Write a protein that binds this ligand. Structure first.
Ligand SMILES: Nc1ncnc2c1ncn2[C@@H]1O[C@H](COP(=O)(O)OP(=O)(O)OP(=O)(O)O)[C@@H](O)[C@H]1O
Ligand SMILES: [Mg+2]
Lengths: 98, 70, 52, 55, 504
């Protein structure tokens, strides 16, 4: 899999200082603690699919193996990254204003 | 007791010779295990015999806000 | 869960036929009773030599 | 007695379960006090103005 | 291939003839057979009747022998034949029983298959003496914040769970089975634990709900359950405590560790009283026989901490005892109190006042003391035990107190907030490194300004923080065992950083 690190969420990242908007900065740290535990719930690799024991234990053949032939060569397309760029776009304009 | 033993082995092989399946069960064992599995498959799940599952999921729209500083 | 559950249904129905069918088959074997006495005592002849 | 697990110890709500003098003095004091609060809460409940227009 | 395995068994069966030492039946009634004959039976020897039931001969009288029946007496007619087996009662034992449901005699009731155990063991063995024992030092982790703080349990101690009906006596002994999953899937061989659970006279539907609770938490691959239910005969609820120690002594004899739970021992003294008064034995106080102390003593003395010359094994015993109206001064609640080491006294008043688990720490003791706590837990809980004990002196001033000294207002202020740390939901057992951090947040003084209703919400927020963002500190209290000066400062800014921005 792939996993990149981050910076320290210690002093600055919870003190964004909006117009008395400490609640929006508090919600920003609350998403990092939730997703890091959901990443700690499941590993990077899933379980392995034993194919040889499937043929003998489910030995009524045809209908068992045809689903196991179609679901084996499938693909899982992850969601889009369209909102990933526009949120990073407003950081470029505000850093020029800061 | 071996002569009693092979008498048992004879009656297992006449029980092997089947053409209609359950001879002594009748409708009693046929209505039971058909209703027993369907009562258990209702607790198990509605899945087909060969339909492989495939779907997709929608991630959250990462929105932004404004904050005027400097 | 269907291939292994239904196997136990005819595993019990197998023995449900035999043990009611043995007693109707050995009830007329009185010609086998005259050797059943003659095979018992030779095991007893084998048995009484153990303590002696 | 009570300075060990073996001996008898008293719980909460043991004056009313006895039913003596203090158990009867407590029931007639919760009633003679909350009888006057059924007066002041019912007299001020007649001060709804919409009912008076119906009157 | 269903016909082939049935033909396989009957040729593999043994049909051989033997001798016997039989004796006719005189008078069967209420589950006590009187047999005339059987001139060479030992005491407590298993016989078997003509129908198929088995029997254990308890009274060796001159002209007859009194044999209890393992079943129902409607199949025993006067004039039957009582053959002899020739052996005292023995149970299968080994590693193969792990993850099965067994009755009091080792048969399989869950319907997976027969036990493949190659060994066999008697149930009437003795305890080890004084020489093969050593003092208890290792901790047995329960996972309850009030047990490991104030009434600890070592690995070889007997601890009694005493209380009334419906106060969470079964639930305290059901998450102690769940909590040992974190060691039982790892690598450290001398920290694993094995749990056995004995149900004595409960209904079959309750045991069928508790196996599913332990199947859900993936905690039925190292647990055995011995079920002698309510419908089963009166002597099968007598053997079943002694049929579990014989499975918990195979792990003590071979250098391993174990745990056993008797649920409950107050239904064994009743199933044994019925067997006595039907055999015409002299009664005593509350119609119990003269040897009900000798019934429970030689079952709890089999729990021992062995030394290194014999293997280093252990056996830990937790018996459950149900009192009636909170009177521990009855007959059986005073036998088992004077045998064991300490009690955990769950009240019913604290259960409805919000304190759950409702452990009364005023009456709960443990006489192995602080010698079974780790060095981290011992340092913080030694002041907490002194702090809570000063609160219980002044609990009677809380209902009308505002005109008191500022020390007394402080003693009330810390006692309420230490109590909220002790409450805990069901089926959530914690770790010792997470337990010591929450106690350290409270006993130092970092909570006397937070509102007493928020102490639960603050704790669930703080624990999920330090698991993900301070994982490298909870590996230097788990592996170190103690809490040093480097970790004392490192934990100090953590609870000051979280408390500063908390309310959001
Ligand atoms: N920590 C807890 N918090 C809240 N509820 C609990 C807790 N522990 C147990 N309970 C509840 O208490 C109820 C009864 O508990 P439990 O059956 O363990 O008591 P018991 O005295 O062992 O029962 P019995 O009297 O049948 O032996 C259960 O319904 C359970 O949901
Ligand atoms: Mg219970």
């Amino acid at each position: 899999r792939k996993l990149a690190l981050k910076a320290i969420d210690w002093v600055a990242f919870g003190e964004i200082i909006p117009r008395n908007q400490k609640a929006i900065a508090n919600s920003l740290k609350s998403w990092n603690e939730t997703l890091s535990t959901r990443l700690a719930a499941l590993p990077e690799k899933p379980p392995a699919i034993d194919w040889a024991y499937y043929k003998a234990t489910v030995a009524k053949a045809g209908l068992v193996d045809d689903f196991e032939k179609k679901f084996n060569a499938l693909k899982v397309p992850v969601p889009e990254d369209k909102y990933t760029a526009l949120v990073d776009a407003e950081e470029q304009e505000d850093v020029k204003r800061c | 007791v071996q002569k009693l033993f092979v008498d048992k082995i004879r009656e297992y092989r006449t029980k092997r010779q089947t053409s209609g399946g359950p001879v002594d069960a009748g409708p009693e064992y046929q209505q039971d295990l058909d209703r027993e599995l369907f009562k258990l498959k209702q607790m198990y799940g509605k899945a087909d015999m060969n339909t492989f599952p495939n779907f997709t999921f929608e991630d959250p729209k990462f929105e932004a806000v404004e904050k005027p500083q400097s | 869960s269907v291939q292994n559950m239904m196997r136990q249904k005819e595993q019990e129905h197998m023995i449900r036929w035999v043990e009611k069918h043995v007693v109707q088959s050995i009830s007329a074997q009185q010609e086998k009773e005259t050797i059943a006495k003659c095979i018992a005592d030779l095991k007893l002849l084998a048995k009484k030599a153990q303590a002696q | 007695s009570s300075d060990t697990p073996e001996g008898v110890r008293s719980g909460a709500g043991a004056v009313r379960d006895a039913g003596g003098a203090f158990g009867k003095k407590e029931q007639a004091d919760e009633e003679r006090y909350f009888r006057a609060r059924a007066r002041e809460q019912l007299a001020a409940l007649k001060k709804h103005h919409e009912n008076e227009i119906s009157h | 291939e269903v016909s082939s395995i049935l033909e396989e068994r009957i040729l593999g069966a043994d049909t051989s003839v033997d001798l016997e030492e039989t004796g006719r039946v005189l008078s069967i009634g209420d589950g006590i057979a009187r047999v005339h004959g059987l001139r060479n039976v030992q005491a407590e020897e298993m016989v078997e009747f003509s129908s198929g039931l088995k029997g254990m001969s308890l009274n060796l009288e001159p002209d007859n022998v009194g044999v209890v029946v393992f079943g129902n007496d409607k199949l025993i007619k006067e004039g039957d034949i009582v053959k002899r087996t020739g052996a005292i009662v023995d149970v299968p034992v080994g590693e193969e029983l792990l993850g099965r449901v067994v009755d009091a005699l080792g048969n399989a009731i869950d319907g997976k298959g027969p036990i493949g155990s190659k060994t066999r063991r008697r149930v009437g063995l003795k305890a080890p003496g004084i020489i093969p024992r050593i003092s208890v030092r290792e901790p047995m982790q329960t996972g309850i914040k009030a047990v490991d703080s104030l009434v600890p349990i070592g690995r070889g101690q007997r601890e009694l769970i005493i209380g009334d009906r419906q106060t969470g006596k079964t639930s305290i002994a059901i998450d102690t089975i769940i909590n040992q999953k974190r060691f039982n899937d790892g690598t450290d061989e001398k920290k694993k634990l094995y749990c056995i659970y004995v149900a004595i006279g409960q209904k079959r539907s309750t045991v069928a709900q508790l196996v599913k609770r332990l199947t859900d938490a993936d905690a039925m691959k190292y647990t055995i359950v011995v079920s002698a239910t309510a419908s089963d005969a009166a002597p099968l609820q007598y053997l079943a405590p002694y049929s579990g120690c014989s499975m918990g002594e195979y792990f003590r004899d071979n250098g391993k560790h174990a745990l056993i739970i008797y649920d409950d021992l107050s239904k064994q003294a009743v199933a044994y009283r019925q067997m006595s008064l039907l055999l015409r034995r002299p009664p005593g106080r509350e119609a119990y026989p003269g040897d009900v102390f000798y019934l429970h003593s030689r079952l709890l003395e089999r729990a021992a901490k062995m030394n290194d010359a014999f293997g280093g094994g252990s056996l830990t015993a937790l018996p459950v005892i149900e009192t009636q109206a909170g009177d521990v001064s009855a007959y059986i609640p005073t036998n088992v109190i004077s045998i064991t080491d300490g009690q955990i006294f769950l009240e019913t008043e604290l259960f409805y006042k919000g304190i759950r688990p409702a452990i009364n720490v005023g009456l709960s003791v443990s006489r192995v003391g602080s010698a079974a706590q780790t060095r981290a837990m011992k340092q913080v809980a030694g002041t907490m035990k002194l702090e809570l004990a000063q609160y219980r002196e002044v609990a009677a001033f809380a209902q009308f107190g505002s005109d008191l000294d500022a020390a007394t207002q402080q003693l009330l202020s810390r006692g309420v907030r230490l109590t909220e740390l002790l409450k805990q939901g069901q089926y959530a057992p914690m770790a010792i490194e997470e337990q010591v951090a929450v106690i350290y947040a409270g006993v130092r003084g970092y909570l006397d300004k937070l509102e007493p209703s928020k102490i639960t919400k603050f704790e669930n927020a703080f624990l999920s923080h330090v698991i993900s963002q301070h994982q490298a500190l909870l590996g230097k209290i788990r592996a170190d065992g103690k809490i040093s000066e480097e970790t004392d400062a490192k934990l100090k800014e953590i609870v000051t950083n979280f408390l500063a921005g908390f309310e959001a």
